[PDB]
């Protein structure tokens, strides 16, 4: 409660980055706090009540975030032989988590843009934020294609897409948002930024997605998903009913089935529906 | 693998070739020879036969990231008409062919040749307007394969990002 | 002469349907600006209202003109005066008006003990024809809460929402990408179609084509209802093949035709490859 408000700074102090990543720069930068001057007590259950505190935001990214980063401090902030250096000086480690998942942007950048085919025009779903770097490391390397944008409508969100691109002069033209159907034909692939990526392969992300995977199943065309390292969970839906609901909020988030997707993207590399939970399991011994 | 089954065993194996060019023949002839009772097949009749048959095996020549795989031509198509009849079909390709590339990442896997391979020189005028193609491969999608037949034993589909892992340096896919 | 009549019967009178009002606009529009021979004025009469009514961006209008032209060919017989061609002989046209308008009671008829209590439905944008065979079911004494989706070129599916809790059932709406987190809740997807072509494709608004890909993806049975008006004759394969005029953003898309499981009008039950079958009985 007290630092929630530093978290509203981060939100909109510098509203390039994601929420996530805000979060994680607003407590790391909380830890020259108020010496509590322990261990146990400090890391384990005061960062655990800050994720109860800040995760009362209608975000699913944020909250494993922190718990990622919880997983990412559990590694070795060791018991190093005295209280001088354990983690409140010895504190570089999670600074250095921070600069590498700042320049994993950087590295998506670099890797997924030359998989783009010249000539398929390709539909974007709402605005993310690693949909335009990629597009933007695609196009500086001199590429030619067309993209559409649906609006995935609980409000307009498309055309914050086409004020993202139009920027840096790229065709784009925004499209309907139930008559994806119509264009669906007309793109041969399909890429769709995350909120979070699933140990089942799927994705969660707002609600604009299931219909476009399962339209690109009934075309028989390759679906394509897009994520970071910030954005891996624990959760595990059958049907939709299970996603949990205050990560549910008329659906403001929703998931798509696991593997009628064809190729998924992350920082740890380009990997294949099954391979998703190996590699999560590699995170958080 | 197919003369070495025949050594103990009883079959009835029906093939079709891959041909822009033939080679096929080659290994028909080749268990021809040891006692099998092959048929040599069109290579466009399999789906008239494919309804009977029950069991189908395919040898490729590399396989990639994806679990996926370029194969001889031809191999696609009857890898979808195996998944019409729901007939399981199996990549006997070893430990040795598995690949970091991705496939719309590089330029054309499928790259092409002299089509005097898949047209006779012999027919006239008619050449000089049509630009005729072909490529020497194949693209199969990852979701096909039923199961490999390593060296170590059968493995899963998609088995393939942890043997990449940890039966390669991944960091150097710089290559 | 005729075109603010025609207006008139189209929005200050929004009971029937648009094809209903063309063909009643047409057949009370035989009292014509008297040319007094059988072909040309048919001809060019017909084919030039046909044309003139076409500042609305509707498919059925001319279907069902043209059904009323395959209609008016039949019985016209030749004895030896021009008063009994068709100008005595317009009764068959009164009739045609109300066994065609009937034929809205007759489908309702025939699929009042079609929806199964308990079983959810999740429906589309408006019809004059999914209300009347709906409360032709609930007037059955039954129930059963609906579903219904946005269809936004427009804020439509609130219309829908009002219409049926005056009707007298629990409504619920829900957002347009919302169709797959729901479509696994419902147990029957009924649409009221746009036009009805002869491969079993029901050209539509612009979420129907969700519906048949989500209903093939849950293996729930896809029914759709016609009346004997709107089986317009072309033939669809895929997403340019519709006139670009049926479209002006676009506004119509087109469902594939394969994949919908069960029809029905006026000439009873139909399994949706039997519409050639009647399509072929139909224009003579």
Redesign the interface.
């Not at chain 2, 998609?158 to 942890?162: A, C, E, K, N, P």
């Given at each position: 409660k007290e630092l929630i408000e530093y978290f509203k700074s981060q939100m909109k102090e510098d509203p390039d980055m994601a929420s996530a990543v805000a979060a994680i720069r607003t407590l790391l930068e909380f830890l020259k706090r108020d010496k509590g001057e322990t261990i146990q007590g400090l890391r384990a259950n005061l960062t655990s009540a800050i994720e109860t505190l800040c995760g009362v935001d209608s975000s699913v990214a944020v909250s494993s975030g922190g718990e990622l980063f919880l997983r990412f401090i559990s590694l070795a902030s060791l018991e190093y032989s005295d209280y001088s250096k354990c983690k409140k000086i010895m504190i570089e480690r999670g600074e250095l988590f921070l600069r590498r998942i700042s320049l994993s942007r950087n590295k998506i950048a670099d890797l997924c843009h030359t998989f783009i085919k010249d000539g398929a025009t390709i539909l974007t779903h709402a605005y993310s934020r690693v949909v335009l770097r990629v597009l933007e490391a695609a196009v500086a390397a001199k590429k030619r294609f067309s993209v559409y944008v649906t609006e995935s409508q609980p409000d307009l969100s498309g055309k914050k897409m086409a004020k993202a691109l139009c920027h840096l002069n790229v065709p784009v033209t925004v499209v309907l948002d139930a008559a994806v159907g119509y264009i669906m034909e007309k793109a041969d692939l399909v890429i769709v930024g995350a909120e979070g990526v699933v140990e089942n392969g799927g994705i969660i992300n707002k609600i604009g997605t299931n219909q476009m995977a399962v339209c690109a199943k009934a075309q028989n065309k390759p679906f394509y998903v897009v994520a970071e390292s910030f954005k891996f969970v624990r959760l595990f839906p059958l049907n939709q009913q299970d996603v949990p609901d205050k990560f549910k909020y008329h659906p403001w988030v929703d998931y798509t089935a696991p593997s009628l997707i064809t190729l998924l993207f992350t920082d740890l590399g380009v990997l294949t529906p099954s391979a998703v939970s190996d590699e999560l399991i590699k995170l958080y011994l | 693998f197919l003369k070495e089954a025949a050594r103990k065993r009883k079959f009835h194996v029906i093939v079709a070739e891959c041909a822009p060019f033939c080679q096929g023949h080659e290994m028909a002839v080749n268990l021809s020879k040891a006692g099998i009772e092959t048929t040599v097949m069109t290579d466009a009749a399999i789906f008239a036969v494919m309804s009977r048959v029950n069991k189908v095996i395919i040898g490729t020549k590399t396989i990639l990231?994806?679990?996926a795989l370029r194969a001889v031509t031809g191999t696609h198509t009857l890898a979808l008409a195996a998944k019409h009849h729901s007939t399981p079909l199996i990549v006997c390709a070893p430990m040795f062919k598995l690949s970091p590339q991705?496939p719309?990442?590089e330029d054309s896997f499928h790259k092409f040749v002299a089509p005097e391979e898949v047209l006779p020189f012999t027919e006239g005028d008619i050449l000089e307007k049509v630009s005729v193609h072909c490529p020497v491969f194949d693209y199969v999608?990852?979701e096909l394969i039923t199961l490999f037949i390593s060296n170590i034993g059968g493995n899963?589909p998609?088995?393939?990002?942890?043997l990449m892992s940890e039966l390669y340096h991944?960091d150097d896919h710089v290559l």
């Open positions: - | 990231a994806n679990g991705f719309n990442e999608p990852p899963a998609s088995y393939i990002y942890r991944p």
